[PDB]
Amino acid sequence: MKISTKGRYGLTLMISLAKKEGQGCISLKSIAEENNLSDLYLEQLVGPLRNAGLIRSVRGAKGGYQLRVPAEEISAGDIIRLLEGESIESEPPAQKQLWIRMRDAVRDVLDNTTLKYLAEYVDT
Amino acid sequence: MKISTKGRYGLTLMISLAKKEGQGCISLKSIAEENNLSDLYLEQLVGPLRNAGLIRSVRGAKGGYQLRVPAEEISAGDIIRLLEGESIESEPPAQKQLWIRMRDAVRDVLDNTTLKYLAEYVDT
Numbered sequence: 359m360k361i362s363t364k365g366r367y368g369l370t371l372m373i374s375l376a377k378k379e380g381q382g383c384i385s386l387k388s389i390a391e392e393n394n395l396s397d398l399y400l401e402q403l404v405g406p407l408r409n410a411g412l413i414r415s416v417r418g419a420k421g422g423y424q425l426r427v428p429a430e431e432i433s434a435g436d437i438i439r440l441l442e443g444e445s446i447e448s449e450p451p452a453q454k455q456l457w458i459r460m461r462d463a464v465r466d467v468l469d470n471t472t473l474k475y476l477a478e479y480v481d482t
Numbered sequence: 483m484k485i486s487t488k489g490r491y492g493l494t495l496m497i498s499l500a501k502k503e504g505q506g507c508i509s510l511k512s513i514a515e516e517n518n519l520s521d522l523y524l525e526q527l528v529g530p531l532r533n534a535g536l537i538r539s540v541r542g543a544k545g546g547y548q549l550r551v552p553a554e555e556i557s558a559g560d561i562i563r564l565l566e567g568e569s570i571e572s573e574p575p576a577q578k579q580l581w582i583r584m585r586d587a588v589r590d591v592l593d594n595t596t597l598k599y600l601a602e603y604v605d606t
Contacts, residue, residue, distance in 0.1 A: 359483070359484045359485060360483045360484050361483060361581065366570060366573070366577070369577055369580075370573060370574060370577060373576065373577060374574075392572065393572040394571075394572055434580060446490060447518075448494070448516065448517040448518055449490070449494060450494060450497050450498075450600070450603075451603060451605040452497065452599075452600040452601070452603035452605075453490070453493055453494060453497060453600065455603065456493075456558060456591070456592075456595060456600065459591050460587075460591045463587040463588060463590065463591050464584045464587060464588060466587065467580070467584045467587050468580075468584065471580060475576075476574070476576040476577065476580065477576070479574075479575060479576035479579065481575040481576075
């Protein structure tokens with residue numbers, strides 16, 4: 359419950375910007391294209407990230423962006439929370455607590471993964 | 483992604499039976515009533531659990547059940563898997579792996595929680 363779609367694409371946006379930190383701007387147009395999204399949809403993700411101070415537009419670029427805060431200071435959890443943010447009454451207290459334990463395990467993974475870490479992941 | 487509803491109710495069924503292990507049967511009727519489900523829906527959860535050998539009907543009880551295997555030998559993960567069982571191509575490999583890490587963390591919680599543990603949880 360669940361990977362919100364906004365969160366996923368927002369994370370991708372941030373990873374792209376992180377790979378460029380201190381190099382210049384990336385256009386919304388290029389990110390939208392790269393990720394099969396409308397610029398309009400991307401715009402809805404940019405808003406909250408900009409408002410939180412994590413990214414900023416570059417003047418005169420007609421929709422160019424860069425990290426405002428260094429990638430090592432931002433967690434995947436931070437990003438998901440900004441973009442994304444069920445009980446069954448009859449459930450036994452033990453079972454309800456099990457779901458809490460799983461939730462917390464996920465949160466731990468998310469909160470302890472930095473954007474810098476995601477940017478520098480090495481693959482074939 | 484997500485707690486399947488079948489899994490949740492199946493887990494609840496199993497916890498109820500576990501609280502009774504070696505005491506006698508519990509009627510499907512009582513479990514359905516206790517949990518705001520139709521007997522018919524419950525029947526769909528019972529089928530796979532019975533087929534896996536985890537529970538068994540009691541003869542002549544017109545729909546009475548008991549654990550067939552001890553609660554300490556069964557994990558929440560086992561139960562969910564029996565009852566319950568998404569990729570976005572453009573996602574960076576680092577992000578795809580993040581989702582795998584979260585999945586595994588959840589699996590760890592689920593696989594290392596026994597039904598006996600859930601049955602003996604102590605609350606106010």
